Design a protein around this ligand. Structure first.
Ligand SMILES: [Mg+2]
Ligand SMILES: [Mg+2]
Ligand SMILES: [Mg+2]
Ligand SMILES: [Mg+2]
Ligand SMILES: [Mg+2]
Ligand SMILES: [Mg+2]
Ligand SMILES: [Zn+2]
Ligand SMILES: [Zn+2]
Lengths: 132, 343, 218, 103
RNA sequence: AUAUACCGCCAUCUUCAGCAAACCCUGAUGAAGGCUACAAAGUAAGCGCAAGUACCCACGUAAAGACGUUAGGUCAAGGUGUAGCC
């Protein structure tokens, strides 16, 4: 019996997403990685820094866009460029959405001294993979 | 630290301790339960200690067709806002924790005189708002299994009825109380017996029977009398639509078999049109309010019989010592004639 | 309202579709419907339908047989004129081919294969939410291979569906509405019942057709 | 109002309906059979006791010989005998005030 | 301090294969049971097993291996409920 990034089978009252449904040993076989960087490859370095900073970024953005997201994020770091991709719901106003977008963009840029940019995709209700 | 901080649901799970050692086996705890509370939904995103004025999320972006500017919420302003939020949280908590008043039935903490409301609509579409439900009993049945051992399995008995002579009893078994109620109510509304009644408020004649060592004797009784019977029978008659009778139960007390024998007798009773068309005679009714006047009840639909019944004298009929006692009047007991509640 | 009048018109008339000409005691005796199992295979509720016994073999009363057969044919024909669904059952594998073939020929349906648990009761979950269960069931062989009462009579008595079964000396005519005493086992009897049902349902269908054409004219 | 138009007033109708007044009342008491004689009263020193009877809790009602259709709901239309206080749920004081009023 | 509040993470049977929401039926409508294929009341969402994926193949090895028992271990990876030093 192993409990590691998996859902407990319920009566059928648990909407689960693709990622939250599939197992961690299915990660390379039937999933992708939430981050995409080269610190892990051989010869590179600063992998610890990459991981720490991306975890902090994920937490900060989850808490500065609270209640609107419905899934994990997609990070895409091409050389210097940093790209974020999120899926959110249409809870609040686009005014607030764009205000927080610009706010987080400026904060991340001034913090990391790095060119940052993000995209957000709207959904009426969070997609579900199955009902477990 | 912030890196050590994490999401909310994990903390809520760890605080509630929903499962793992105490929830299983049914041992539970000493009726202590931490109520789930949602904090993110409560406050607006803009609320904080430093009350900067935010045209983006906290303040409307445009006013009088003029763009706004960042401003300050001073000491007494943010204090007013904090007091308002405290009052709002207290109101939400009050509305959260309150009493729950499910109507007292046969007794407190008992599911006897409780009604689940009418059955649910059918899949093809079948509305049963005319039907009223009733939970006769509920019991925590236990049966053991190899690996998990004792399992709690709720069994429930229910009845349903119109108030127009149609009704049905049923049982329901499930691991959950509400699910068992639902199963029982559905298959009850599907399983129903009809019984006739004489003048919308009584049975046609007294019925004495036995069923699984459960002797039961119901006696017809005229208007202005009420229902002095076992409380289960009282609720069942409320569902049926008859307003008054008498009844007695002797021997074992298992209300499942009680209801089964009750419906069996109420179904096997013969109507007066039935009996008249069977025998070939005119039924004649006599009251005490009315004098010596023959009131015909029902006549044979077929050809009437020519000769009348010969007078049956000293009939071979097995009677009851208790009712003979109560008729002779020598019987005495404080427990017989009590001035109970309404019906 | 005139539609209800057309639906109700055949009821007042007796033998309105002329079902009597199909059968006669001559034909029944020729098809050997009058036979019965041994006295050991006798049944209480079937006793009164037994005209007598010979060589410890049971014999059926042909007057009662003809009465019940007339009633059954009349009911089936009224239902067919009402377009009511009809469903045949014959668990006996000796005639499943013929019975399915005549079912195809009639347009009314049949189930000769193994009967599944709760096929009628849980039919909603089995097939779908909205499904029209049949309006009439009939039995060419009331008992199964092991000789128990087929679950279909019980299911029909439960869910209020009428049943018309040919009851042999081993069968239980209590649940049956229109029990027809006869010979469930003989091939002549099976073929004769099938042909009679073909003629009856087809006459009812073509009669509904002609009446509908007459009303479309008028 | 001392007169009996408060009964025809539709607040009475929506508060009760076609049912009698005693039908809604229910007694809190010991287990099984209740006591055989109701409480002495529902009002004391211009103070009301918890779970009072309906005719006492509804102060706008007035028990008098003149309110015939209010008094007749207790005594059965099919038998002239008046129902008892343990039946109708009222205290003995107002019960016997009602019995003398109907007399 | 409390693993006898817990989350998170694992041993165990498991070198198993069953676990099962939702319906129906039998038992006089009791706890409970539902298997007979030349077939007699069982139908099954879903999970698991399995299949496919990784290594050199389709085998093999890994991986996976549910419901639950052992109030199994861990408040000493980390956090947190309760009780305390403050
Ligand atoms: Mg392992
Ligand atoms: Mg109490
Ligand atoms: Mg432990
Ligand atoms: Mg496998
Ligand atoms: Mg392994
Ligand atoms: Mg231990
Ligand atoms: Zn035979
Ligand atoms: Zn009072």
């Amino acid at each position: 019996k192993n409990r590691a990034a998996r859902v407990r089978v319920s009566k059928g009252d648990k909407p689960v997403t693709y990622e939250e449904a599939h197992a961690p040993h299915y990660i390379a076989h039937r999933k992708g990685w939430l981050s995409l960087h080269t610190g892990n490859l051989d010869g590179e370095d600063h992998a610890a820094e990459r991981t720490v900073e991306d975890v902090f970024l994920r937490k900060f953005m989850w808490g500065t866009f609270p209640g609107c997201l419905a899934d994990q994020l997609v990070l895409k770091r091409r050389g210097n460029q940093l790209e974020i991709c999120a899926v959110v719901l249409r809870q609040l106003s686009p005014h607030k959405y764009y205000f927080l977008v610009g706010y987080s963009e400026t904060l991340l840029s001034y913090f990391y001294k790095c060119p940052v940019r993000l995209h957000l995709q709207t959904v009426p209700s969070k997609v579900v993979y199955k009902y477990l | 630290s912030f890196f050590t901080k994490l999401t909310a649901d994990e903390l809520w799970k760890g605080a509630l301790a929903e499962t793992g050692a105490g929830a299983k086996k049914g041992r539970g705890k000493r009726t202590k339960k931490k109520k789930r509370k949602d904090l993110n939904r409560g406050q607006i995103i803009g609320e904080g200690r430093y009350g900067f004025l935010w045209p983006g999320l906290n303040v409307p972006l445009m006013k009088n067709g003029a763009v706004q500017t960042i401003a300050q919420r001073s000491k007494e302003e943010q204090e007013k806002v904090e007091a308002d939020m405290i009052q709002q949280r207290e109101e939400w908590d009050r509305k959260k924790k309150m009493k729950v008043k499910r109507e007292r039935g046969w007794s407190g903490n008992s599911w006897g005189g409780i009604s689940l409301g009418p059955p649910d609509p059918g899949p093809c579409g079948e509305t049963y708002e005319d039907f009223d439900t009733r939970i006769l009993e509920v019991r925590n049945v236990f049966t053991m299994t190899a690996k998990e051992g004792r399992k709690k399995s709720i069994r429930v008995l229910v009845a349903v009825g119109n108030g127009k002579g149609a009704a049905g009893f049923s049982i329901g078994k499930a691991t959950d109380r509400m699910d068992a109620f639902r199963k029982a109510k559905n298959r009850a509304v599907h399983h129903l017996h009809y019984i006739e009644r004489y003048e919308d408020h009584t049975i046609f004649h007294d019925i004495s029977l036995r069923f699984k060592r459960t002797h039961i004797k119901m006696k017809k009784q005229p208007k202005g009398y009420g229902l002095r019977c076992h409380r289960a029978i009282i609720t069942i008659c409320r569902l049926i639509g008859i307003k008054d009778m008498y009844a007695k139960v002797s021997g074992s007390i298992n209300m499942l078999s009680l209801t089964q024998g009750l419906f069996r007798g109420l179904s096997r009773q013969e109507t007066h049109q039935q009996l008249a068309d069977k025998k070939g005679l005119h039924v004649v009714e006599i009251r005490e309010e009315c004098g010596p006047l023959p009131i015909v009840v029902a006549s044979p639909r077929g050809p009437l019989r020519k000769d009348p019944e010969p007078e049956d004298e000293v009939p071979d009929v097995k009677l009851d010592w208790e009712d003979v006692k109560t008729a002779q009047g020598m019987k005495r007991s404080v427990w017989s004639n009590l001035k109970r509640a309404a019906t | 309202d005139f539609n209800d009048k057309i639906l109700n018109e055949p009821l007042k008339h007796s033998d309105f579709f002329n079902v009597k000409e199909l059968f006669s005691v001559r034909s029944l005796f020729d098809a050997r419907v009058h036979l019965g199992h041994k006295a050991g295979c006798r049944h209480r509720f079937m006793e009164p339908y037994i005209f007598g016994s010979r060589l410890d073999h049971d014999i059926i009363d042909l007057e009662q047989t003809a009465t019940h057969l007339q009633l059954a044919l009349n009911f089936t024909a009224h239902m067919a004129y009402r377009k009511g669904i009809i469903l045949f059952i014959s668990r006996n594998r000796q005639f499943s081919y013929l019975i399915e073939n005549m079912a195809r020929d009639c347009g009314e349906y049949a189930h000769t294969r193994y009967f599944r648990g709760g096929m009628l009761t849980n039919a909603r979950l089995l097939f779908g939410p909205t499904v029209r269960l049949p309006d009439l069931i009939i039995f060419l062989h009331t008992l199964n291979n092991i000789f128990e009462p087929h679950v279909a009579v019980r299911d029909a008595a439960k869910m209020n569906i009428p049943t018309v079964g040919i009851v042999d000396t081993n069968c239980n005519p209590c649940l049956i509405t229109y029990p027809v005493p006869g010979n469930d086992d003989s091939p002549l009897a099976v073929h004769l019942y099938c042909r009679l049902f073909q003629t009856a349902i087809t006459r009812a269908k073509e009669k509904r057709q002609q009446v509908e054409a007459l009303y479309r004219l008028q | 109002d001392e007169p009996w138009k408060y009964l025809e007033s539709e607040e009475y109708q929506e508060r009760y309906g076609s049912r009698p007044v005693w039908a809604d009342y229910r007694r809190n008491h010991k287990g099984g059979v209740p006591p055989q004689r109701t409480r002495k009263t529902c009002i004391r020193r211009n103070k009301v006791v918890g779970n009072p009877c309906p005719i006492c809790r509804d102060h706008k009602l007035h028990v008098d010989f003149r309110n015939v259709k209010l008094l007749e709901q207790f005594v059965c239309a099919h038998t002239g005998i008046i129902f008892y206080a343990p039946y109708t749920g009222v205290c003995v004081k107002q019960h016997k005030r009602l019995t003398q009023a109907i007399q």
